[PDB]
Design a protein around this ligand. Structure first.
Ligand code: 8R6
Ligand code: 8R6
Ligand code: FE
Ligand code: FE
Length: 649
């Protein structure tokens, strides 16, 4: 059977679920998904049922999505309710901290201020703010209301115990837990700020726009960011305390049945969704409100499959809630991300030589490493410019660049014999790329080549090639040299992967190689002893310049496609300051003063530079690069980038 066992937490939810079940059978062919209605006492019993393989799916709030993920349940998000409507599906809400312009403080200065909360136990209003501020709270931090009452000088915390902690109702005496209180609710908390009662209001990114219709009024307010700066209120996407998902269907991490759950719900919304006018309505019921799904929902979106819970909730939210539940308070060692066996051992004795200042975490892919940096499992790692872009869209920032001497050059290399080749028409020719998605091998070359054909389906412009990372059936995987599962894979077990592998690809079967400027010289004249390169001379190879001419290899300065942003270290903004510092020390202690090739960093790197003002993926790579990458993402297959862009379209 292709049955999805849906978990209800009430008799009304069960009744609607049974109706859901019956109407599906009139709509879905017998070879398709069906529904079964398991009923439990609570969302946690549902979570446990799903993990115990007694049910498959339930819809939860962000707090429960965290519970569902914790061991031993290990559930993940698979489908997302969206709101607003089809044009612009709203899946998340942002918890923000609104303040008045020129009030002169930031998040790390909230102690002593007057606070406005939507209500005790509420999320944007209480749980999130308090969870981020937890370790700033005075001890003892239990009971939490007492700690909060000894942190802000006075507050309006609706439904707080004003009798034992009157500070929490100074701005709304009695702490009224109803709209009878003027400072209650999302709109009430903002009023507490607007009226001058308080200095900050913990609400949602939308509260302000729903209570002030004119931009002139809104310009008198700002948001507190966690980097201890401020931004305007229409920039909440870059200045919030947490990005929270409104309503999320969860399922087993292994054992699914993600694919059926989506097929079921996708066809459910197509026949019974918003404004479908049937006897049965997926987003309402006469039996009660918000059964199975929120009544205000407009449809379902499929959660990208790379997404796990910690990634879907986000670093900030997870930090907040984790603090409230564990209650554990503390520059601490940098946890570096290693991608392979050889990289790991190099890291391991970097950790021993460091006397603790650097620990080592290992993952199997770069994107798995970035995911660990995002969610806290790891801290830093060095990345090609094409991966810092991905790391940027995912919320990370660059802390340091690799200097080898403005960075390295992206050159297109050709065999001198074949002298018909010019940059102006390589159409129908054999191409060699380091890997799809990287500066020299793809982003720059295919960036420029995107402008002159107006599309990124490059397996049709070129005849064939090796671009490790393309779908293994593509014409840009036919020249690759890996055997078995390694054919065309973007790692070492594909011989044509990397700067030099792409040049080897040119030597043995390609017509042009997109590569850095030091690659040909460093792999010719016997400098590389492996048979394929040992007897090569760099004079047999030329570079294609953009004007349309050709030029020898060692005068790349006048014959390059563009300047390439240097590789860079990336981390979370909440560790930018400490990763910079740890590393620079570890550099004049182990710098220019890898056992195989280029572990952790490229060994030709001489020092790690700081960027001053270019600590953003947009300001480090430059506008013309991100514009190019933006054009090539249309044809990109990066599952991690698909997850991060789901959170930030
Ligand atoms: C209805 C509802 C929602 C949908 C939603 O995002 N907005 C509707 C209600 C907003 C106000 C308020 C509440 O109803 O309790 N918020 C309290 C909270 O988050 O705990 C819900 C909210 O964040 O929107 C929600 O997101 O969370 C809820 C948690 C509850 N406990 C009870 C109800 C909700
Ligand atoms: C790492 C380092 C050390 C060892 C050490 O104790 N490091 C921590 C020093 C913290 C102050 C730090 C800073 O400005 O943040 N020093 C180094 C720097 O300027 O980068 C300042 C200084 O000692 O002049 C040191 O003793 O002298 C340095 C001088 C430098 N120039 C750069 C780095 C260092
Ligand atoms: Fe709420
Ligand atoms: Fe690179």
């Amino acid at each position: 059977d292709k049955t999805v066992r849906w978990c209800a937490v009430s008799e009304h939810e069960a009744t609607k679920c049974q109706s859901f079940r019956d109407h599906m059978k009139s709509v879905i062919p017998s070879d398709g998904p069906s529904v079964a209605c398991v009923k439990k006492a609570s969302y946690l019993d549902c979570i446990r049922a799903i993990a115990a393989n007694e049910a498959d799916a339930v819809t939860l709030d962000a707090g429960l999505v965290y519970d569902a993920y914790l061991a031993p349940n290990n559930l993940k998000p698979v489908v997302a309710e969206f709101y607003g409507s089809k044009e612009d599906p709203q899946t998340f809400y942002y918890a923000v901290a609104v303040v008045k312009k020129d009030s002169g403080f930031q998040m790390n200065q909230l102690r002593g201020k007057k606070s406005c909360h939507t209500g005790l136990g509420r999320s944007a209003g209480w749980n999130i703010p308090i969870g981020l501020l937890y370790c700033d709270l005075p001890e003892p931090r239990k009971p939490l209301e007492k700690a909060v009452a000894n942190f802000f000088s006075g507050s309006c915390a609706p439904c707080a115990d004003g009798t034992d902690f009157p500070q929490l109702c100074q701005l709304c005496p009695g702490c009224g837990c109803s709209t009878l209180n003027q400072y209650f609710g999302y709109s009430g908390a903002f009023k507490c700020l607007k009226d001058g009662a308080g200095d900050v209001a913990f609400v949602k990114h939308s509260t302000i726009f729903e209570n002030l219709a004119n931009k002139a009024d809104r310009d008198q307010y700002e948001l507190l960011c966690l980097d201890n700066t401020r931004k305007p209120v229409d920039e909440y996407k870059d200045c919030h305390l947490a990005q929270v998902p409104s309503h999320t269907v969860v399922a087993r991490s292994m054992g699914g049945k993600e694919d059926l759950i989506w097929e079921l719900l996708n066809q459910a919304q197509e026949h019974f969704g918003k404004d479908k006018s049937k006897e049965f309505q997926l987003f309402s019921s006469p039996h009660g409100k918000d059964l199975l799904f929120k009544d205000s929902a407009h449809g379902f979106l499929k959660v990208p499959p790379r997404m796990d819970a910690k990634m879907y909730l986000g670093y900030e939210y997870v930090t907040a809630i984790r603090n409230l539940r564990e209650g554990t308070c503390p520059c601490k060692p940098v946890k570096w991300c290693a991608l392979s066996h050889h990289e790991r051992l190099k890291c391991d004795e970097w950790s021993v030589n460091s006397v603790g200042k650097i620990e080592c975490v290992s993952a199997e892919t770069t994107e798995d490493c970035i995911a660990k940096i995002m969610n806290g499992e790891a801290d830093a790692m060095s990345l090609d410019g094409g991966f810092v872009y991905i790391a940027g869209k995912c919320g990370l920032v660059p802390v340091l660049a690799e200097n080898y001497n403005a960075g390295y050059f992206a050159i297109a290399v050709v065999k001198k014999s074949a002298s018909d080749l010019t940059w102006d028409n390589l159409k129908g020719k054999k191409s060699c790329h380091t890997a799809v998605g990287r500066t020299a091998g793809w982003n720059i070359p295919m960036g420029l080549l995107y402008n002159k054909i107006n599309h990124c389906r490059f397996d049709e412009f070129f005849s064939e090639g090796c671009a490790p990372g393309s779908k293994k059936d593509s014409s840009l995987c036919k020249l690759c040299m890996g055997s078995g599962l390694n054919l065309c894979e973007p790692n070492n077990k594909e011989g044509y992967y990397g700067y030099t592998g792409a040049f080897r690809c040119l030597v043995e079967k390609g017509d042009v190689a997109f590569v850095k400027h030091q690659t040909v010289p460093q792999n010719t004249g016997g400098k590389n002893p492996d048979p394929w390169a040992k007897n090569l001379n760099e004079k047999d190879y030329e570079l294609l310049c953009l004007d349309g001419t050709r030029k020898p290899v060692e005068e790349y300065a006048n014959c390059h496609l563009a300047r390439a942003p240097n590789h860079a270290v990336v981390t979370r903004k909440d560790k930018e300051a400490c990763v910079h510092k740890i590393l620079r020390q570890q550099q004049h202690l182990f710098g220019s003063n890898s056992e195989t090739k280029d572990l952790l960093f490229r060994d030709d790197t001489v020092c790690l530079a700081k960027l001053h003002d270019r600590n953003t993926y947009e300001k480090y790579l430059g506008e013309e690069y991100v514009k190019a990458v933006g054009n090539l993402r249309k044809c990109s297959t990066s599952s991690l980038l698909e997850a991060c862009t789901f959170r930030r379209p």
